[PDB]
Amino acid sequence: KLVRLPGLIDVHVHLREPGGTHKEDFASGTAAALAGGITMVCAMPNTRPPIIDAPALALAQKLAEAGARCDFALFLGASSENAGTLGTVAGSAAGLKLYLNETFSELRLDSVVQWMEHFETWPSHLPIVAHAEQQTVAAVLMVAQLTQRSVHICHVAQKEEILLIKAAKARGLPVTCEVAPHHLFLSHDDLERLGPGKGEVRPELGSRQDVEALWENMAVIDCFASDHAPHTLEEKCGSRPPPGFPGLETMLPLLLTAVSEGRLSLDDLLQRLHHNPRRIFHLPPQEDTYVEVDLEHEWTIPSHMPFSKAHWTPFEGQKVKGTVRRVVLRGEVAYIDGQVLVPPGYGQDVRKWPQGAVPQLP
Amino acid sequence: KLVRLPGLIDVHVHLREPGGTHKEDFASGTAAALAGGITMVCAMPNTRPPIIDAPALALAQKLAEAGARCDFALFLGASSENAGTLGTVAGSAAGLKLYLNETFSELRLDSVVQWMEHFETWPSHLPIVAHAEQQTVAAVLMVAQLTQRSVHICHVAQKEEILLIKAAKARGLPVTCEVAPHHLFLSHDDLERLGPGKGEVRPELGSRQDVEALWENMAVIDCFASDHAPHTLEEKCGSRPPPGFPGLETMLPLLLTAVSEGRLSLDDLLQRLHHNPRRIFHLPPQEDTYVEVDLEHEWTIPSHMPFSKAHWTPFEGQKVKGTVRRVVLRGEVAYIDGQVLVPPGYGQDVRKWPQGAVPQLP
Ligand SMILES: NC(=O)N[C@@H](CC(=O)O)C(=O)O
Ligand SMILES: NC(=O)N[C@@H](CC(=O)O)C(=O)O
Ligand code: NA
Ligand code: NA
Ligand SMILES: [Zn+2]
Ligand SMILES: [Zn+2]
Ligand SMILES: [Zn+2]
Ligand SMILES: [Zn+2]
């Protein structure tokens, strides 16, 4: 007996097209998504060229419409130069992404005044998300309060971060957050196995006490999102390894294992991979779309998953219970037992759907 | 220029059929819903006969399928006799409703042990909602904790109640709540105008400080819901007046006025009348469904609204800004400028849709 789930949403993926297509492209990344039970993804803008203006957005849109196998929205990225220039295209993007620390990106904002300018000029009804580690979470929350609007915090990893967000919610402040699976299922205890190259990620892996704090404060976590960040093994094992893990194909199996162990409920899971992603980002429903999972199947994660071009995974050797058996997307069978069955280009930009626009005042 | 909204959801309405059809029936109540921009309603079980067993549910389902003009789900009601007997039909209902105080109902539970039995026997993945006033909110929250599950609190009205729920959420407890428009827009200051008959409602109208506390703690309010409780003027003005107000046709106009005044944002409104109702009750999307409102139109609420058989309203004389211009439901024009255009029976039971079942473990 299978369980039917709605079409799950991952609001934080890196599909590397344009400019890094040896790591992943729209076609391979969305195949990995479907294989992990994900039918809609929001793609980050730290590509080459980065999606920081209208021409780059236009290019990315066509590449995604031609290559994506599942549906998608594309983030715009904040730069030191583009505040106040995105108003005509802002509504066509998933939202605006701010890079406030040193990760795999050059979209550096070198002053909190630049953060303020983006919060003041980006349309107030559209989403803003921030890469903000440790004390940076408090700093960007200050900027959100000074400009009287909401903010969403990407991949929360540490006790310090989730407790701060918890205190902000208790004061009624409009903040939401997401947590990625490696920060719930990996810790410093795993760095000896992974090694210093494979183990590079931002935010870095936390302590066992960080992981325990995230689980203890599950009520504070609005979304799960993979931060699918594919790099090749050659890159991860080389002299200057880039940070990030692939994760689309492993996220739901890991979380289903936790559900079967009683660590969280099926509803807890569906709030965080469907309902809350919808409502925070104003993402539309998907007609005739659902995911069938088998909760009984026990298996061990191999050295690489079938679809991501990253061709490695930090969860190798972990035992999981639960697997994706079939995915239907808008009335067509998209995935069955390891075979993707919709071609590149089947996926659509959900912000072009009439129901996919963010409502605003005239 | 109109604003397009998604199909709004009211999770707390009384449509009085079967048994009280002089107050309202499915056809008149759902016409009032469409006129107020509501495309799906959840109907309470305190009818005559009350919906407290499988035969009564079957009857109510057919009456709704034949009379409803918008889509719907039907609550089951908890009784002193039916704990442990609803398992075969539980999944077909919106949820289980507990009447824990003395309102317009005989579904009296005369012991917290009966509350415990319902929390233990109702399927753990399906919704439970409670009419729970003042200290009863704390008592039912205790029962939810003892049985390790969630609860939803109906029409929160007082500072005491919202602050208690706020403290529970700060402790991570799984509780949600709804607030009705009369407790945001009416107070003791209005009882002299209404009089003791028309003014009877449960929970009773609060003080100006109660109303200010609800607005101050908007972040704690998960849903708006009308508690549409129609009674005739003869009944409200008679010797033994029943409690309750009609409200489907006035709820969105009142809230749109508040939005135009800057008291809350359009997003705040759509979280509470669309996204959170969906996710708390696992209600499915509605294809090709939307509501067009005009935010500029200023008008005064008359002595009765066009569609509810209650033929009165406690908001008479209040000035509002905002009106529903057009509603489309599953591809058909359902309402335009005061004319309902879908017939009785157009509406469907959303729990029969494949996407409308609540997911559960096998
Ligand atoms: N380790 C990561 O997090 N890597 C991400 C960037 C990011 O999300 O910061 C990437 O794009 O490679
Ligand atoms: N005043 C009310 O609240 N009336 C409701 C009952 C209820 O919701 O308690 C009714 O059914 O009339
Ligand atoms: Na396409
Ligand atoms: Na019908
Ligand atoms: Zn990041
Ligand atoms: Zn990222
Ligand atoms: Zn009630
Ligand atoms: Zn009621």
UniProtKB/Swiss-Prot annotation, chains A, B:
**Ligand binding ((S)-dihydroorotate):** R16, N46, R202, H231, P243
What disease is associated with this protein? Answer: Developmental and epileptic encephalopathy 50: A form of epileptic encephalopathy, a heterogeneous group of severe early-onset epilepsies characterized by refractory seizures, neurodevelopmental impairment, and poor prognosis. Development is normal prior to seizure onset, after which cognitive and motor delays become apparent. DEE50 is an autosomal recessive, progressive disease with onset in infancy and favorable response to treatment with oral uridine.
Q: Which residues bind Zn(2+) 3?
A: K97, H131, H155
Can you state the subunit structure given in the record? Answer: Homohexamer. Interacts with CIPC.
Q: Which residues of the full protein are shown?
A: 1460 to 1821 of 2225
Q: Mind telling me how this protein is modified after translation?
A: Activated by MAP kinase (Erk1/2) phosphorylation just prior to the S phase of the cell cycle, when the demand for pyrimidine nucleotides is greatest, and down-regulated as the cells emerge from S phase by protein kinase A (PKA) phosphorylation.
Name the consequence of H155A: Abolishes dihydroorotase activity
Organism expressing this protein natively:
Homo sapiens
Q: Where in the cell is it found?
A: Cytoplasm; Nucleus
> Which of this chain's residues are annotated to bind Zn(2+) 1?
H12, H14, K97, D227
Query: What is this protein called in UniProt?
Result: Multifunctional protein CAD
Q: What is the effect of changing H12A?
A: No zinc-binding and no catalytic activity
Q: Where is the active site?
A: D227 (for dhoase activity)
